[PDB]
Every structure is written in structure tokens, then in C-alpha cells.
Design a protein around this ligand. Structure first.
Ligand code: ZUY
Ligand code: MG
Ligand code: MG
Ligand code: MG
Length: 226
């Protein structure tokens, strides 16, 4: 419209990355803690996907009949867990979709991600880029435990430079869905406190149609946060 070849995937990737780049900076200038918001939204979207799938595939929720989001803090082990029972991710998705983005130099493999899928690098960046990279505002590493209906449970790790994926030695523990694990920095220890997580979760979960729980306490159990 004002530049050459704006319809190109090269331009679409740059425009999407610029958009994400501006969303994270703007959040840092106003201090908005978008990552947990993005995690709850991204978990809700995965539940929407598997529920849309269940509308046509009768045996889609067989691995896990509940549609929840469960957030858990491990102040001892310094970990943040966001677990959804959504569509889940196959190993192919973790490697060729998320892995291609997480691995450095993603802009080299734009045409490799173009050869009809309906999921291009720029589209994946616009959909999941803000949530993925805002996690590195508070975390040093992102570990993804995911079990899709058409694959076995895998575990996937990245520091936004390299990535690695193995099969879960524990087997099929999720049934279906994804657990996002953030290895938070020491300067992000505030988000291991129950009160700040419960408050932030209830804020971002007020308008979510899916039940969202937080591991709360002399006995611990899942607490409804609406
Ligand atoms: C790229 C790509 C395709 C992957 C799509 N995708 C993501 S991306 C993401 C990850 C892996 C970790 C963080 C901290 C944030 C984001 C946004 N999360 C889920 C999910 N829970 N369920 C189903 N699909 C998901
Ligand atoms: Mg233009
Ligand atoms: Mg897409
Ligand atoms: Mg590295």
C-alpha cells in the first residue's frame, strides 16, 4: 500500500514480529504483566479448539473429559505451571511449528514453512508470538509438556535460542492437553507467591467461560477462580 511487496510472507513475518515487539515494549513501559494474561488466553484458546473438535469427533474428549485450566506455583522448586486440557500438541507441531520459531534465526526458514498448511510462520507469530516471548520477561526457560490425541506425550524445552524435545518418561500423564512450565528468574520470585497469582488469575479469568483453578491452601487443593 506504501511499500514494495507488502503481500509477501517476508513482509508479513516482519510486520508480525514488529507488532509483537511493540506489544511487549508497550507492556514494559506501562507495566501490565501480560505473560500470565497471555498464558490464560492461550490455554482458553486450546480448550476452544478441542471443544470445536468434539462437536464433530465424538471420541475426542476420551483422554480427558474435563475442560479446565489449572495454575500451580512451586515456590520451593521455583516453577510456574499453567495446565490446560485443550487440543494438545503432537511432536510434529512442537518441532516444526513451535520449534522452528523458538530456534534462533527463524527468518531463514520462512519459505520452508510455506510449502497450504494454513499455519504460516507469520500467522503463528501473530497468534502465539506475544505469549511465548513475554514468558521470557519472567522466565529463563520454557518447558512444554503436551499430549495430543494423535501422538504420545512429549516434553519440549527452549531458552528462545535452541530447543529440544524428548518423549515423556512418565508416559501419558495429561491424557490430553498441555502444561506450560516457566523456570522463573530470581527477580520474578513474586509470581511464586499465592496471593499475587490468585489476584492476577481472577482478574484475567473473570470473562473466561472455562473453569480456571489455582493450587491454593492447612491443606492444599484446586480453588475455583471462575
Ligand atoms: C508456535 C506454535 C504452536 C503452539 C501453539 N500452542 C501454544 S504456544 C506457547 C507456548 C508453547 C508457550 C508459551 C509460554 C506461550 C505460548 C503462546 N500453547 C499451546 C497450548 N497450551 N495448547 C495448544 N496449543 C498451544
Ligand atoms: Mg503500504
Ligand atoms: Mg495459524
Ligand atoms: Mg542456548
Amino acid at each position: 500500500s506504501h511499500m514494495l511487496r507488502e503481500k509477501s510472507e517476508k513482509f508479513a513475518f516482519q510486520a508480525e514480529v514488529n507488532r509483537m515487539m511493540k506489544l511487549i515494549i508497550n507492556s514494559l513501559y506501562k507495566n501490565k504483566e501480560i505473560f500470565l494474561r497471555e498464558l490464560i488466553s492461550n490455554a482458553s484458546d486450546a480448550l476452544d479448539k478441542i471443544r470445536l473438535i468434539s462437536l464433530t469427533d465424538e471420541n475426542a474428549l476420551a483422554g480427558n473429559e474435563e475442560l479446565t485450566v489449572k495454575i500451580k506455583c512451586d515456590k520451593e522448586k521455583n516453577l510456574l505451571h499453567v495446565t490446560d486440557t485443550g487440543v494438545g500438541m503432537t511432536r510434529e507441531e512442537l518441532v516444526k511449528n513451535l520449534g522452528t520459531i523458538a530456534k534462533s534465526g527463524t527468518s531463514e526458514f520462512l519459505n520452508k514453512m510455506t510449502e497450504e498448511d494454513g499455519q504460516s510462520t507469520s500467522e503463528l507469530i501473530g497468534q502465539f508470538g506475544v505469549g511465548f516471548y513475554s514468558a521470557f520477561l519472567v522466565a529463563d526457560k520454557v518447558i512444554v509438556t503436551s499430549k495430543h490425541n494423535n501422538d504420545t506425550q512429549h516434553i519440549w524445552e527452549s531458552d528462545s535460542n535452541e530447543f529440544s524435545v524428548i518423549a515423556d518418561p512418565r508416559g501419558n500423564t495429561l491424557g490430553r492437553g498441555t502444561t506450560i512450565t516457566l523456570v522463573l528468574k530470581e527477580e520474578a520470585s513474586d509470581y511464586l507467591e499465592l496471593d499475587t497469582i490468585k489476584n492476577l488469575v481472577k482478574k484475567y479469568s473473570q470473562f473466561i467461560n472455562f473453569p480456571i483453578y489455582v493450587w491454593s491452601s492447612t491443606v492444599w487443593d484446586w480453588e475455583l477462580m471462575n
